[PDB]
Amino acid sequence: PINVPSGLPAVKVLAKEGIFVMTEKIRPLEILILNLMPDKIKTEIQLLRLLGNTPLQVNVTLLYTETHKPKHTPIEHILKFYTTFSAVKDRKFDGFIITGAPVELLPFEEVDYWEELTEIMEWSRHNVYSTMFICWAAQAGLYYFYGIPKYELPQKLSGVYKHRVAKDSVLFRGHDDFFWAPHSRYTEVKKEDIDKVPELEILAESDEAGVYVVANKSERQIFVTGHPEYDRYTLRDEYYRDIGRNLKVPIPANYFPNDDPTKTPILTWWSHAHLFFSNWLNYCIYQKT
Amino acid sequence: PINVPSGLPAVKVLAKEGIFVMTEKIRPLEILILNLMPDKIKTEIQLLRLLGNTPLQVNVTLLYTETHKPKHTPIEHILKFYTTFSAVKDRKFDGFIITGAPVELLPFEEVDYWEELTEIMEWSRHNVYSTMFICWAAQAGLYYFYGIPKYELPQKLSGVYKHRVAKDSVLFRGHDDFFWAPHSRYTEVKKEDIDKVPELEILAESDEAGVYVVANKSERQIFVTGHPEYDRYTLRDEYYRDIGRNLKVPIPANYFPNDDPTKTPILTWWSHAHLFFSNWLNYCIYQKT
């Protein structure tokens, strides 16, 4: 069902979970991913897992900035699998995901590649049917399209938080009254700013985590502040990493049994993640363009 | 997406939840429903809700026994919308749902229409790709195909119960470690009987509710002992009904806030229900026949 570049690590990883990606030649959906994460291989796997759960054919195209300051991912992988804005200016896509980045703490305009991002964002307004913006990207987009500013939090929001649906959307078909989603970020946007923009609507939120999903009335722009796509272990690995660097930090919230980091975490947000991305593909894209 | 008979009440009901059924003329999936419930209109709505959540086209055919002893549903509705085994012997279907019935307390062979049911069940072995059997039907089928007997429970199992996945299946893609499903029945089948039949596998179970989902190795037969398709209110209406008949009975388990029947119930099993029926349609049927 989902099609991806030939040697992508995700193929063999996902193959282990019954998810058989492919690498060969109604029409398939064209889904673009602008991967801004530091661990690009992990994020690929997490997103591809959810784009594949479906009977629709998806073709995935992996995009990067021409500005590369080497973070985690090695240069070879980006060179092999990733393309630039220039090679896709001229195409149109049914969907587009712009992922998080570890960049919350700078003003938007003082990010290396804000100007590139801006051109791409603007382009997606016209060449992508529905664009989804995750984590810091939600903030970048809410800011660039609607003037919605971000704010530093007293401390880091890191854990799994409980949410409710604030406004009906097809995106939340199949949801229970309450669901869980991970958040991991040092900044936030606010109901009170968003509330001043009629084009925007708050679809889900959390008392602990705040605004979670906001969207256009047409749902051609969807802003997600958390990380529904994270693995059971994602937060744990981050925790063990920081602790191993002798940094003192909070145990992620509502994640570890009894808040015990040796005791393995309980997976509570898979259902939401899967429903959410299926609905996007089926309801926000396939049945609309 | 989902197609159904012209005047079905479900059309207008589901239309209220954005689910636009249809009534006109890859090919559509042919899904047969043998509705044995006493409230046939309710069950239609509950099942159609979950068969429709999908990008695949489904055509639904509503089947009944030629034996009718009038329960709840009026004769006019059955006469208008329902057809008999004879009119469908000759067709083949991709999927088939056989629903519950209020019949647990009789031996199988002393049910009015066991012999009709038996002929239909046998037929589905050959003319239906994947057959799903719910509530009492799970028991009828487990019994008829594998010799698996049912047992009376000390008291009635009535509530929402927590479950785990016991064996991996595509049916449970997107599930959390633990999920909820309603059960409402006076009888049960047992791990210990099922365990003696290699063709069977237990896919989900509950410590409180017991065996929940069992299946063929090919998943061409799926047995569900609970009612994932129930509305928020289904258990409440049953409760108010029985209490109004001055019958003393248990408050349904894990359903009412604080076990208070005026306080409205919290919907906790929608996610599971939706994932489960999507997976059936996508993974157990569409990608196989």
Side-chain angles (χ1 to χ4, degrees), chain A residues 1-11 13-23 26-41 43-70 72-88 90-91 93-190 192-287 289, chain B residues 1-11 13-23 26-41 43-70 72-88 90-91 93-190 192-287 289:
Chain A
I2 197 153
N3 186 20
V4 83
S6 195
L8 207 68
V11 171
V13 178
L14 296 175
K16 285 171 180 183
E17 309 158 21
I19 305 172
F20 310 109
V21 190
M22 75 163 284
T23 311
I26 60 167
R27 53 153 192 93
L29 297 177
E30 299 287 359
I31 306 291
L32 183 67
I33 301 181
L34 168 49
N35 192 344
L36 304 172
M37 293 290 272
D39 200 342
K40 300 197 163 163
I41 288 163
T43 296
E44 281 158 23
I45 296 155
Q46 294 169 6
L47 288 173
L48 280 167
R49 181 175 289 115
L50 306 159
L51 299 172
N53 190 48
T54 184
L56 301 151
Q57 306 195 12
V58 175
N59 290 346
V60 171
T61 298
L62 293 168
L63 183 64
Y64 182 48
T65 45
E66 297 168 33
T67 312
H68 177 59
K69 315 223 143 156
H72 187 240
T73 291
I75 190 170
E76 289 91 335
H77 174 90
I78 294 158
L79 278 180
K80 180 160 189 194
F81 301 105
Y82 281 78
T83 196
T84 80
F85 176 63
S86 296
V88 302
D90 287 319
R91 299 170 52 182
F93 292 83
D94 302 283
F96 183 27
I97 296 161
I98 308 192
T99 74
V103 180
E104 325 82 2
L105 301 174
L106 305 168
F108 289 122
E109 290 84 349
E110 295 178 6
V111 174
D112 327 357
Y113 55 76
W114 183 254
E115 296 186 62
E116 283 195 33
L117 181 57
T118 282
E119 190 188 4
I120 292 158
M121 287 193 304
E122 185 64 28
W123 168 87
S124 90
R125 194 154 157 198
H126 297 112
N127 291 55
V128 181
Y129 187 78
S130 182
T131 295
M132 182 187 296
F133 304 80
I134 301 164
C135 194
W136 177 80
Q139 296 182 347
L142 282 176
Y143 170 70
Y144 170 79
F145 291 116
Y146 307 98
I148 280 160
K150 63 175 163 82
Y151 304 83
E152 190 169 13
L153 296 161
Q155 63 168 8
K156 200 201 182 164
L157 191 64
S158 172
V160 183
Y161 303 96
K162 192 169 106 189
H163 302 73
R164 83 180 63 98
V165 177
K167 202 279 184 160
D168 272 3
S169 158
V170 297
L171 284 164
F172 291 92
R173 189 148 302 153
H175 280 64
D176 308 307
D177 281 353
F178 302 109
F179 60 84
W180 298 86
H183 289 255
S184 194
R185 54 174 160 87
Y186 289 88
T187 63
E188 80 173 332
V189 292
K190 285 188 193 184
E192 65 183 2
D193 291 329
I194 289 164
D195 198 56
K196 307 178 168 182
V197 181
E199 178 58 319
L200 295 186
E201 292 180 321
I202 298 173
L203 314 182
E205 72 204 355
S206 160
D207 287 317
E208 282 179 9
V211 179
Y212 175 50
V213 192
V214 189
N216 251 7
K217 298 206 164 163
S218 63
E219 282 168 352
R220 294 199 45 203
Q221 284 171 350
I222 302 158
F223 307 91
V224 186
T225 57
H227 277 286
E229 77 280 4
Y230 270 18
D231 292 329
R232 173 190 264 103
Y233 285 116
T234 310
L235 285 170
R236 179 205 69 190
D237 295 355
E238 302 202 35
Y239 184 70
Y240 281 22
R241 165 151 179 70
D242 292 347
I243 291 295
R245 283 157 75 67
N246 279 325
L247 311 162
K248 324 295 172 175
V249 308
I251 296 181
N254 315 307
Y255 179 69
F256 285 121
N258 192 238
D259 297 337
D260 198 324
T262 66
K263 302 282 159 263
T264 62
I266 300 204
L267 189 54
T268 52
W269 66 94
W270 228 220
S271 46
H272 155 57
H274 281 74
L275 293 165
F276 187 80
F277 281 84
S278 305
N279 297 340
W280 180 54
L281 287 173
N282 166 44
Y283 294 108
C284 293
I285 295 169
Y286 171 72
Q287 304 188 22
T289 292
Chain B
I2 197 153
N3 186 20
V4 83
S6 195
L8 207 68
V11 171
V13 178
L14 296 175
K16 285 171 180 183
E17 309 158 21
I19 305 172
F20 310 109
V21 190
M22 75 163 284
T23 311
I26 60 167
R27 53 153 192 93
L29 297 177
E30 299 287 359
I31 306 291
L32 183 67
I33 301 181
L34 168 49
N35 192 344
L36 304 172
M37 293 290 272
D39 200 342
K40 300 197 163 163
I41 288 163
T43 296
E44 281 158 23
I45 296 155
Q46 294 169 6
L47 288 173
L48 280 167
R49 181 175 289 115
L50 306 159
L51 299 172
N53 190 48
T54 184
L56 301 151
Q57 306 195 12
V58 175
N59 290 346
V60 171
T61 298
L62 293 168
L63 183 64
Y64 182 48
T65 45
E66 297 168 33
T67 312
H68 177 60
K69 315 223 143 156
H72 187 240
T73 291
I75 190 170
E76 289 91 335
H77 174 90
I78 294 158
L79 278 180
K80 180 160 189 194
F81 301 105
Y82 281 78
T83 196
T84 80
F85 176 63
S86 296
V88 302
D90 287 319
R91 299 170 52 182
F93 292 83
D94 302 283
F96 183 27
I97 296 161
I98 308 192
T99 74
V103 180
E104 325 82 2
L105 301 174
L106 305 168
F108 289 122
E109 290 84 349
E110 295 178 6
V111 174
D112 327 357
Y113 55 76
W114 183 254
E115 296 186 62
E116 283 195 33
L117 181 57
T118 282
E119 190 188 4
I120 292 158
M121 287 193 304
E122 185 64 28
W123 168 87
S124 90
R125 194 154 157 198
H126 297 112
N127 291 55
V128 181
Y129 187 78
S130 182
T131 295
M132 182 187 296
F133 304 80
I134 301 164
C135 194
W136 177 80
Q139 296 182 347
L142 282 176
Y143 170 70
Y144 170 79
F145 291 116
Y146 307 98
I148 280 160
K150 63 175 163 82
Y151 304 83
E152 190 169 13
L153 296 161
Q155 63 168 8
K156 200 201 182 164
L157 191 64
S158 172
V160 183
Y161 303 96
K162 192 169 106 189
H163 302 73
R164 83 180 63 98
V165 177
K167 202 279 184 160
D168 272 3
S169 158
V170 297
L171 284 164
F172 291 92
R173 189 148 302 153
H175 280 64
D176 308 307
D177 281 353
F178 302 109
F179 60 84
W180 298 86
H183 289 255
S184 194
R185 54 174 160 87
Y186 289 88
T187 63
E188 80 173 332
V189 292
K190 285 188 193 184
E192 65 183 2
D193 291 329
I194 289 164
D195 198 56
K196 307 178 168 182
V197 181
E199 178 58 319
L200 295 186
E201 292 180 321
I202 298 173
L203 314 182
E205 72 204 355
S206 160
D207 287 317
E208 282 179 9
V211 179
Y212 175 50
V213 192
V214 189
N216 251 7
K217 298 206 164 163
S218 63
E219 282 168 352
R220 294 199 45 203
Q221 284 171 350
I222 302 158
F223 307 91
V224 186
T225 57
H227 277 286
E229 77 280 4
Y230 270 18
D231 292 329
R232 173 190 264 103
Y233 285 116
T234 310
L235 285 170
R236 179 205 69 190
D237 295 355
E238 302 202 35
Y239 184 70
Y240 281 22
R241 165 151 179 70
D242 292 347
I243 291 295
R245 283 157 75 67
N246 279 325
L247 311 162
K248 324 295 172 175
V249 308
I251 296 181
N254 315 307
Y255 179 69
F256 285 121
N258 192 238
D259 297 337
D260 198 324
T262 66
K263 302 282 159 263
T264 62
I266 300 204
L267 189 54
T268 52
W269 66 94
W270 228 220
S271 46
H272 155 57
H274 281 74
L275 293 165
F276 187 80
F277 281 84
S278 305
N279 297 340
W280 180 54
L281 287 173
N282 166 44
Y283 294 108
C284 293
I285 295 169
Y286 171 72
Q287 304 188 22
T289 292

